[PDB]
Amino acid sequence: VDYLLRLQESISDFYWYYSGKDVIEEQGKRNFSKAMSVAKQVFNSLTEYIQGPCTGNQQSLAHSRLWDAVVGFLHVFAHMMMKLAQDSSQIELLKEL
Amino acid sequence: VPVLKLVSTLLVMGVFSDEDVKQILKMIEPEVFREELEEGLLQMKLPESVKLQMCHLLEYFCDQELQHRVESLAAFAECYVDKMQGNQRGRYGLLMKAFTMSAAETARRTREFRSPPQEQINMLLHFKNGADEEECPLPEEIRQELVNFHQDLLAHCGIQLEHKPQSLQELVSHTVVRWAQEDFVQSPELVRAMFSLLHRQYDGLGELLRALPRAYTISVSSVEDTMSLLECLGQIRSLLIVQMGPQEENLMIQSIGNIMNNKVFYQHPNLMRALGMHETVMEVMVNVLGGGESKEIRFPKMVTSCCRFLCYFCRISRQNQRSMFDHLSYLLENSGIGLGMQGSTPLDVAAASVIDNNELALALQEQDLEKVVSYLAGCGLQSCPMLLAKGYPDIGWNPCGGERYLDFLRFAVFVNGESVEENANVVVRLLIRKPECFGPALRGEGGSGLLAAIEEAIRISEDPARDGPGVPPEENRVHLGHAIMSFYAALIDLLGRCAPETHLIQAGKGEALRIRAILRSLVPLDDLVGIISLPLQIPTLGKDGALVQPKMSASFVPDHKASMVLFLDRVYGIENQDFLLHVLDVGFLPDMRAAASLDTATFSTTEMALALNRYLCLAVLPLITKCAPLFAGTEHRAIMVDSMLHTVYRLSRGRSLTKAQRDVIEDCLMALCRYI
Amino acid sequence: MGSELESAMETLINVFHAHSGKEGDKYKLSKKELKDLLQTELSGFLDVQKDADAVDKVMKELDENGDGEVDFKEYVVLVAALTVACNNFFWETS
Amino acid sequence: GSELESAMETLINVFHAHSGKEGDKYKLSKKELKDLLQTELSGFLDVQKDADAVDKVMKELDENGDGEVDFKEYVVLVAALTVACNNFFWETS
Amino acid sequence: GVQVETISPGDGRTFPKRGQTCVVHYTGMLEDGKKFDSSRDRNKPFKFTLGKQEVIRGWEEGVAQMSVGQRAKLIISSDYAYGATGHPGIIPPHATLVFDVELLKLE
Amino acid sequence: NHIKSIISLLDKHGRNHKVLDVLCSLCVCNGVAVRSNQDLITENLLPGR
Amino acid sequence: LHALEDARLPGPLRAGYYDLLISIHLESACRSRRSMLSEYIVPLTPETRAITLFPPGRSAEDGPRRHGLPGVGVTTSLRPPHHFSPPCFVVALPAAG
Amino acid sequence: IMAKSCHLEVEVSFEEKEMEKQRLLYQQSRLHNRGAAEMVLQMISACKGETGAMVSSTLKLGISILNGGNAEVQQKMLDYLKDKKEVGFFQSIQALMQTCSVLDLNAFERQNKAEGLGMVNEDGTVINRQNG
Amino acid sequence: VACFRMTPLYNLPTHRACNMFLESYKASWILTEDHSFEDRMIDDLSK
C-alpha cells in the first residue's frame, strides 16, 4: 500500500506537469505507460492478497492508507481521460489508462 | 596432486611446447586427442582433489580454445574490412563519376558516406536477415564470405546442428556429468569448477560474446610500446595484493610515469578502458587511502600520482570521463579526508570526471551533491585535526577543506560558460538547508558579514601568532588569513555561478527569479562593493634597492576580488549609470591605476603585477566593455572618465602582457570610445 | 610586375615572408603561424571548396605539423594542395 | 579573398591555359609543360643565381619524360627555381 | 684481506688479467662451516669478468691470484665481503666467508 | 621487537609448530602480503641456521 | 629437484617441496600470465592472417568436423615475456641504499 | 537457465491447453523437486535488501517456478519459511520495496535537456546521447 | 558542417576498422543469433 501511495503521488505530480501542455510528447507517453504498467501490477497483487476472501487482509487494507491512493487515482483518471480523449493520437495511452 | 599442480603451473606460464601439450593431451584422454595404460586420467577413477586439478587443466584448454576463436575472428575481420574498404572506394569513385544527374538519388547515396564510420559499418553489415542492394550496397560476393565465416563460427562453437566424445566440448560435458552422476561431490570448489566448465561448454556463443569486449587489434608498429605498457600494467596489477610500502610506492610511481609517457595510452584509450587500468589504479589509491584513516594518509606521493593519472585519463577522452563518472560516488566516499597531502586528491579526480561535460553534469546525482554538501557542513562546523596537531590556532572551522568542496561544487554547477539550472538549484537549496556551509561570517544568528570577515582575515594575516603556529616544506604550510579569504571567495564564486541565466530571468521563470532573490538575500551588494574597494598591497622599491614583494600565499590577492566581481556581474548586475560610476570610482579605477603603475621594468613581471593583469583582464575590463553603453551622457564625471580612458590606454601600452589580455584591453577601449 | 606568372610567384614570396618576418628573421617560418596564414588568407577558397577529402587532409596536416618547422617549400606545396582542393570541384583532376 | 588568393588563380589560370595543349583539364603532358616552364620562368632562369638549382631543373626536364605531371609537382618544380633565386638575393637569416 | 690456500695445483703460467672473463665453480661456506651457496648444485659454472665490480673484492683478488685449472680455498674477511650490511636472509652481518673455488677456464 | 619475541618463543620453548603457524599468519592475511613482516621474519629467523 | 623425483618422501613433505618449488620459482610468473590471459590484443601480423577457425581439411563443408588439438598451434595474442634472475650470492650488492 | 527451462508457452483446443499446462507443471517439477524453491527463498533472504542482478535473477527464477499458481511450490515455500522462522526473508522483501523507484520529474527534465543537447562530433566517435 | 564534411570508411586505418567491425559483428550477428540450450542442458543434468 505504501509503495502504491508513492506511485500515485508520482503520477499525480507528472500529470500536473503535463496539464498545461496541449499534447503529451512521446517520452511523456512512454513514462506514463511504464508507470501505469507498474500500478496495474501492484493492483493485481493487492487483489490477489484480498480475494478468497481474506478477512484479515481486507481489514488491514481498510485501516491502511489505500483510500488516499484510490482518491489520487480517481482524480488523475478523470482529468487524464478528459485530456487524452480531446486528442486522437493518444488513444493507446487512453486504453491503457 | 603435486605433479598436476606443477604441470598446470607450467601450462599457465605457457612454457610447454606443442609436442609437450600433445603428450599432456594424450595423457588426459588418448582417444579423443589422438592425432590422425589405455585408461586416461579422466577415466582413471581418481579422488576429488585430483579431479579438481584435472578441472584446472580442462579450464586451461577451454581458455585456449576461446583464444583461438577470438584470434580467428580478428583475422577474418582483417580480411573482410579490407574488402569492404576497397569496395567502398570503388563505390565512391562511381558516385563521384555520377554528374548529379538526379539529386534525389545523389543525395540518397551520399548520405551513407556523410554518416559516421561506425554507422557506415553497421549499415554495410546489416544484411543478416536479407537486404537488397539499395539498402545494403554490399555485393553478394562479399556477403557470402561473411555468411560462410558465420556458419563456420557456429559450427566451431557447436550451435550448428555420440557414444564417444570426439571433441573437447563433448569430452568435458560427458566427464562432468559422469562425475556428478557417479558420486555426490563433497567438495564445493570441485562442484563450482565442474559446473563452470559445463556451462562454458554448453554456452559456446555466450563465452565468445563475453570475451570479445576484451579483444583489441593493433598495428604491427605499436607492438613494442603495447608490450611495454602491458609490462607496466602487470606491475600495477601485482601491487594490488601487497600492503603498500616504500619499494611498492616507488614502483607504482615509476609504472604510472612510464604509462603516461607511452604513446599507446593516447592512441588507444579504448584498449585502456578494456584493460581496466583506471579501475586498478583507483583500487590501489582507495586501498592506501583507507589504510590508517584515523592517523593520516600514508604515502601521500603515491596518492598524488594516482590522482594525477586518473584526472589526465579523464582528460584524454570523453568516454574515459564517463567511465570515471560511473565511479564518481566511490571517489566521493573516499574523499572524506584530504589536503593533508596538498597534491591531487580523489576530490580532484571526481571534479575532472564531470568537468566541461553537459551530459555528465545533467546526469549527476542529488545524492552525490548532498554528500559533498555534508562534507562542506562538517568543514564549517569542526576544525582540522592535522592543523591543530601542527599547532595552528584553533579557529573552529576548516576553510582549507571547505574551499576544495566549494571548488567541486563550482565545477558541478558551472559548465562551458553557462550555469546548469538543475544542479545550481539543487546546490542552492542544499546550502540554504545547512547554513553552516556559508561559514561563521554569514552564519545568521550573529554573523558579522562578509566585508567584516574579510577585513578580519586581513588583520589575521597581518598579526603573527594568530595566522600561524608561531612556535615550512611547502611555502610555509598554510596561512589562516589567506585560507579564510580563499574560502569566502570560493563560496561567493559558487553562488555567482549558481546565479540564473539572463535569458531565463527575462523569460520570467519563477524558479530563476526565486533563486536570484535568494542569492541576493544571502549576499548584500554593499559588502561586495566594499570588498572590491579593499586596498591591495603593491610591490615597492625600498631598503637599498630591495623589492618589497607581498607574499601571495599569505596575503589578500586580486582573485578574491575577482570572485566578488563575478558575483556582482551575474547576480546583481550593473544597470544604472550612477552605480557603474560609483563602483568604477571606488573599487575598479584604483586597481587599474595600480596595474598601470606596476608596468615598469622593475615590477612588470612581479607576481602581484601578473595577478592584477589577470584579475583586470578576466573580471573588470570585460565588465566595463559590457557596460560601455552606460557611459553615454556622463559629462558630469568628465574628469573621472578621462582618467579611466588614460589608465586603460596606459595598460594597453604594457609589457609582459599576453596577446589575449591585450586583445581584451583593446576591445574595452574601442567599446568605451564608441559610446563616449 | 614583369611577366604575370612571375609576379604571382613574387606575391607568394611576399605573403610567406610577411609571417617569416614576424616569427623568424626573414626566411624561417614556424607552423605555429603557418596555420593562421593558411586558414586566413585561403579563407576565400575553402568557402567554395567542396573536396571534403582534401580539406580533411589539410586539417590532418595542421595537427601533424604542430612541431613547428616549415619553409617556403612546405607552405607553397600545402597551399597548392588547398587550391587544387578548392578548384578540383570546379575542374576534373581525375 | 586576399591577394594571395589572386596569385593562386593566376597559377591555376596559367596551368589550365597551357593544359589545354595536351592534358584534359587539370592534367598536362610534360612534353608541353616543359615549354611552359622555361617560357614562363624565362626571366628567372635567365637571372638564375644558383647553378645547382638551374642544373637540377635542366636534369628534371629529362628525368620526367612520362608525358604526365601533376600540378603539385609543377608548383614544386617552379618553386625550386624561385626559392633558389630568392635565397641568393636575400640574407637567409 | 683475502687469504688463498691451494687445494689442488694449477698450470702456474696463466693467471686472469683485467677485462678477461673467468669461469669458476664455487661453494660458499660461512666461517662456522654452514653452506649458503654453490654453483655445482645449479650445475652451471659461474662466469664473471674482472675489473667490472660484479663480484666482491675478495673474489676480485682471490681469483686474480689463482691460475687456470686451480682449486683453492679463499678466506674473505667481513669488510672485503658484504660487510656490516650483509646479505639479508643469507649472510649475517660482519661474517667472514670461506669459498672453495675451482677456476675452470678463461674466456 | 614483536617478531623477535615470537622467534625467541621458538628459541626458548622448543620446536613448536604452532609458533611456526603464527609466523606464517604474520606474512599473509586474506590474500594480502605484508612485506615488512615477511622481510623481518626472514632476516631474524633464516640466516642464523 | 631431488625432492621432486623422490618416491619415498612422506606425502606431506613431498607436497611441501613441490609447492615450495612452485612458490620460489614459478608462482609470480604464473600469477602475472594468468592476469594477462584475460585480454586478447591481436597484432595485425601475417601470422594473425594465417589463423583460421578450423585446420585445413576436407572432412566437412563447415571446416573439418574435427577441431585442432586445443592449445596447439599459432597464437599471436600479445603476452609479455617472463623475466628471471640467476640465483647468485657472490655478486656485489648495489652501492646505493 | 533454470528460469528459461519453464517455457510458459486463435484459441487452442481444450486438450492443447491442458497438455501445455502439463508440460509447464512437469518442467516446474524438475526444479522444485530438487530444492529450487528453498534456494530461491534462501537467496532472497541472503541478498539482505540490496538490489542487484543476483536478486533480479532469483526473483525471475521464483516467478518461473511459481507461474500458474503452482500449489505444490507454494506449499514447499510455506513449509520452509514456517519451519526456519527467519525474519531475513521478509526484511529483505521490505527493503527491496522501499528501494523500488517511482516517476521522477527532476530526472525527466534532466533527461529531456540532455536529449535536446546534441554532439557536434561524429556519432561514431562520441556517445551522441545514448544513456540509460 | 560535419554532415557536409565527408567521413569515408576507406580513409580509416585497418586496425580501427577491424575494431569497429568486431563491435558491429558482435552487436548484430553474434548477439542476434538464438540458441536454446536450456532445455537440453536441464534434461541432461536431471537424468
* Cell 487482509 sits on residue: A57
Residues of E designated catalytic: 26, 36-37, 56, 82, 99
CA-based nearest residue to I4, from B111, C45, H121: B111
What is the Cα–Cα distance from B125 to B84, expressed in whole angstroms? 10
The DSSP 8-state label assigned to residue I30 in this structure reads: I
Give the nearest chain G residue to B29 (CA atoms): G69
Instruction: State the DSSP H helix or E strand holding residue I32, giving kind and residue range, or none if neither.
Output: none
Annotated binding site of A for Ca(2+): 48
CB E58 within 8 A of CB E81: yes
CA-based nearest residue to B534, from B555, B556, B518: B556
- Dihedral sign of CA atoms B654, B656, B660, B664 in order: negative
3-state secondary structure of H70: coil
What is the Cα–Cα distance from B274 to B257, expressed in whole angstroms? 20
CA-based nearest residue to F37, from F24, F27, F23: F27
CB A24 within 8 A of CB A18: yes
Cβ contact (<8 Å) for F35 and B242? yes
CB B457 within 8 A of CB B441: no
Q: What angle do CA B142, B143, B148 make, to 5 degrees?
A: 105
What is the Cα–Cα distance from G20 to F42, expressed in whole angstroms? 15
3-state secondary structure of E95: coil
Torsion of CA D29, D30, D31, D36, to 10 degrees: 100
Q: Nearest-CA distance from B115 to chain H in Å?
A: 8
CA-based nearest residue to B275, from B306, B241, B337, B320: B320
CB H29 within 8 A of CB H6: no
CB contact, 8 Å: C47 with chain I? no
Strands (E) across chain C are located at none
CA-based nearest residue to B234, from G80, F35, F32, G27: G80
Greatest distance between any 2 Cα atoms in chain A: 45
DSSP H helices in B291-398: 300-316, 318-334, 346-354, 358-363, 366-381, 385-390
- Dihedral sign of CA atoms G3, G8, G9, G12 in order: positive
Q: What secondary structure does DSSP assign to B482-547, as a single string?
A: HHHHHHHHHHHHHHHHHSPPHHHHHHT-HHHHHHHHHHHHHS-HHHHHHHHHSPPP--EEETTTEE
Residues in chain B: 676
Burial of E43 (0-12, 13-18, 19+ CB in 10 A): exposed
Q: How many CB atoms lie within 10 A of CB B475?
A: 11
CB E24 within 8 A of CB E100: no
Question: G70 to chain B: which residues are within 8 Å by CB?
Answer: 25, 61-62, 64-65, 68, 168
Q: How many CB atoms lie within 10 A of CB B403?
A: 21
Q: What secondary structure does DSSP assign to B403-423, as a single string?
A: HHHHHHHHHHHEETTEE-HHH
- Residue of G21, G33, G61, G69 to mutate for B, most B C-beta atoms under 10 A: G69
Residue B473 contacts by C-beta under 8 Å, 6 or more apart in sequence? none
CA-based nearest residue to H121, from C66, C42, B326, B359: B359
Touch between chain A and chain F: 3 or more Cβ pairs under 8 Å: no
Q: Which residues partner with E106 through β-bridges?
A: E22
CB C44 within 8 A of CB D4: no
Cell numbers found for residue B377 = 557542513
Residues in chain F: 49
Residue I4 contacts by C-beta under 8 Å, 6 or more apart in sequence? B114, C52
What is the count of residue pairs from A and H with beta carbons less than 8 Å apart? 26
Cβ contact (<8 Å) for H117 and B358? yes
Burial of B478 (0-12, 13-18, 19+ CB in 10 A): buried
Which of B429-459 are b and which e, b meaning 16 or more Cβ less than 10 Å from the residue's Cβ?
ebbeebbbbbbbbbbeeeeeebbebbbebbe
Give the HSE-up count for residue B501: Cα atoms under 13 Å, Cβ half-sphere: 12
CB contact, 8 Å: B221 with chain I? no
What is the Cα–Cα distance from H55 to H48, expressed in whole angstroms? 10
CB B185 within 8 A of CB B194: yes
Q: For residue E23, which phi and psi values (nearest 5 degrees)? A: -105, 130
CA-based nearest residue to C48, from C82, C83, C86: C86
Burial of B294 (0-12, 13-18, 19+ CB in 10 A): exposed
CB contact, 8 Å: B382 with chain G? no
What is the Cα–Cα distance from C74 to D75, expressed in whole angstroms? 11
Cβ contact (<8 Å) for F47 and E34? no
Cβ contact (<8 Å) for F47 and E90? yes
Cell numbers found for residue H111 = 533527461
What is the Cα–Cα distance from C8 to C1, expressed in whole angstroms? 9
CA B67 to chain centre: 33
Q: What secondary structure does DSSP assign to B122-169, as a single string?
A: HHHH--SS---TTT----HHHHHHHHHHHHHHHHHHT-----S--SHH
Cα-Cα end-to-end distance for chain C: 34
Q: Nearest-CA distance from F43 to chain E in Å?
A: 5
CB contact, 8 Å: I15 with chain G? yes
CB H114 within 8 A of CB B358: yes
3-state secondary structure of B299: coil
Cβ contact (<8 Å) for B243 and F31? no
Cβ contact (<8 Å) for H129 and B359? yes
Question: G45 to chain B: which residues are within 8 Å by CB?
Answer: 220
Chains in touch with F (≥3 Cβ pairs < 8 A): B, E
What is the Cα–Cα distance from C74 to C29, expressed in whole angstroms? 10
